[PDB]
Write a protein that binds this ligand. Structure first.
Ligand SMILES: CO[C@H]1C[C@@H](C)C/C(C)=C/[C@@H](CC(C)=O)C(=O)C[C@H](O)[C@@H](C)[C@@H](/C(C)=C/[C@@H]2CC[C@@H](O)[C@H](OC)C2)OC(=O)[C@@H]2CCCCN2C(=O)C(=O)[C@]2(O)O[C@H]1[C@@H](OC)C[C@H]2C
Ligand SMILES: [Cl-]
Ligand SMILES: [Cl-]
Ligand code: NA
Length: 108
């Protein structure tokens, strides 16, 4: 599948992201073996995005939509729902499944 969502700690079970809302998160991005390539946590600054604008990889678009506010989850994202056969220069190899540890902090 494009994304698999595995819950680390539950959310509110009620408030799920909608178009027009700003999702505020912390994340750590890694390969399937846990090797870290990026983290907002390390910058002590949350990351913000919105649905429906093609501004995040599709695995986030579909994974975070399945999370409720407060939830922490592991999103395992297939290459086609991330950087595909190309990868990301300097950061992620070709054909890489990505794992993001994401905390959905709030909707604004
Ligand atoms: C430290 O910078 C990070 C981005 C951010 C914090 C800084 C901004 C606002 C940069 C601007 C620079 C700019 C010129 O606008 C930017 O790139 C914004 C953009 O929306 C990103 C937020 C988005 C992304 C790269 C979308 C692509 C847009 C093009 C489409 O074709 C692509 O489809 C395949 C998808 O990121 C994502 O979807 C995913 C999921 C959310 C968390 C980040 N993501 C990751 O994969 C990471 O962990 C990664 O390390 O995060 C860093 C990132 O640098 C560029 C490389 C990637 C590997
Ligand atoms: Cl935003
Ligand atoms: Cl925006
Ligand atoms: Na943008």
């Amino acid at each position: 599948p494009g994304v698999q969502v595995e819950t680390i700690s539950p959310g509110d079970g009620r408030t799920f992201p909608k178009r027009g809302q700003t999702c505020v998160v912390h994340y750590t991005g890694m390969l399937e073996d846990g090797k870290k390539f990026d983290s907002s946590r390390d910058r002590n600054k949350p990351f913000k995005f919105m649905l429906g604008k093609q501004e995040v990889i599709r695995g986030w678009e579909e994974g975070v939509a399945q999370m409720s506010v407060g939830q922490r989850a592991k999103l395992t994202i297939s290459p086609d729902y991330a950087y595909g056969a190309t990868g990301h220069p300097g950061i992620i190899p070709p054909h890489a499944t990505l794992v993001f540890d994401v905390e959905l902090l709030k909707l604004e």
